[PDB]
């Protein structure tokens, strides 16, 4: 039936997800429990460990808070490219209006970054540089303001979100559902977007049944978190309004500028 077309969708999306993103939640969780036979991540808990850790972290090439925040930017910019490549794999996404493609990504990417960033997070800290590093939550709190407050809400959201014990195959459709948001400010031709999202939501529903109990209630939980996201995305962009003025010295990445342009 059409219940077969939905498993095809979920499996096509999952394959795009594996290929588009370097590190799956599967591996990320393995690393975070030491359970992996792979080498341990260099643990960063203070400036000393950061300065010793420059070795095992994808380099950049002057203040530690600003240097750490500068690390997030390059990671975010790589994520936007991985997310943009994945969106292109969502059946009918590239057939949409190229202005609507830009709009869906503009608003979608930070919500998906935070969804996927939870995969790398526990209460104690965050896997960075594709699992080669582990930056502690306490250390990130210890940064001078406004940089101290930069990643706490992401930690807060991740501990709630990780509750739902979703898998990669759940996350592939979920993030596809987040991109295909009909209600994004500035969208020209909504109904084609809203059509696709209905398809993805059916596939998400089916996927969640075949993998979890209290499915409608999980599926329900998972669609309210989808607004917990827009919250922390709004909160995040205000903190960057703060940082753009209060820290005139440090510059923002041109791609991160294209996105935050007229955002909330």
């Amino acid at each position: 039936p059409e219940s077969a077309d939905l498993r095809a969708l979920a499996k096509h999306l999952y394959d795009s997800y594996i290929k588009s993103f370097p590190l799956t939640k599967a591996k990320a969780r393995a690393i975070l429990t030491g359970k992996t036979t792979d080498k341990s991540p260099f643990v960063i808990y203070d400036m000393n460990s950061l300065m010793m850790g420059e070795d095992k972290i994808k380099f950049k090439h002057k203040e530690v808070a600003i240097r750490i925040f500068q690390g997030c930017q390059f990671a975010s910019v790589e994520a936007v490219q991985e997310i943009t490549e994945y969106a292109k794999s969502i059946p009918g996404f590239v057939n949409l209006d190229l202005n609507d493609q830009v709009t869906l990504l503009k608003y979608g990417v930070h919500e998906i970054i935070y969804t996927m960033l939870a995969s790398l997070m526990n209460k104690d800290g965050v896997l960075i540089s594709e699992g080669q590093g582990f930056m502690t939550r306490e250390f990130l709190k210890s940064l001078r303001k406004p940089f101290g407050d930069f990643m706490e809400p992401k930690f807060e959201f991740a501990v709630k979100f990780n509750a739902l014990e979703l898998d990669d195959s759940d996350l592939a459709i979920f993030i596809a559902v987040i991109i295909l948001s009909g209600d994004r400010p500035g969208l020209l031709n909504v109904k084609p977007i809203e059509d696709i999202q209905d398809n993805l939501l059916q596939a998400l529903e089916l996927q969640l049944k075949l993998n979890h109990p209290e499915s409608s209630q999980l599926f329900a939980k998972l669609l309210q978190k989808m607004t917990d996201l827009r919250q922390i995305v709004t909160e995040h962009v205000q903190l960057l309004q703060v940082i753009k003025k209060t820290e005139t010295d440090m510059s923002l990445h041109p791609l991160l500028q294209e996105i935050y342009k007229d955002l909330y």
Binding site: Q81, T84, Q101, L105, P254, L255, E258, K261
Partner: peptide, 11 residues
């Protein structure tokens, strides 16, 4: 406006 986004999409 949105030059790099356009580039990455049409890429």
């Amino acid at each position: 406006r949105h030059k790099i986004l356009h580039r990455l999409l049409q890429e």
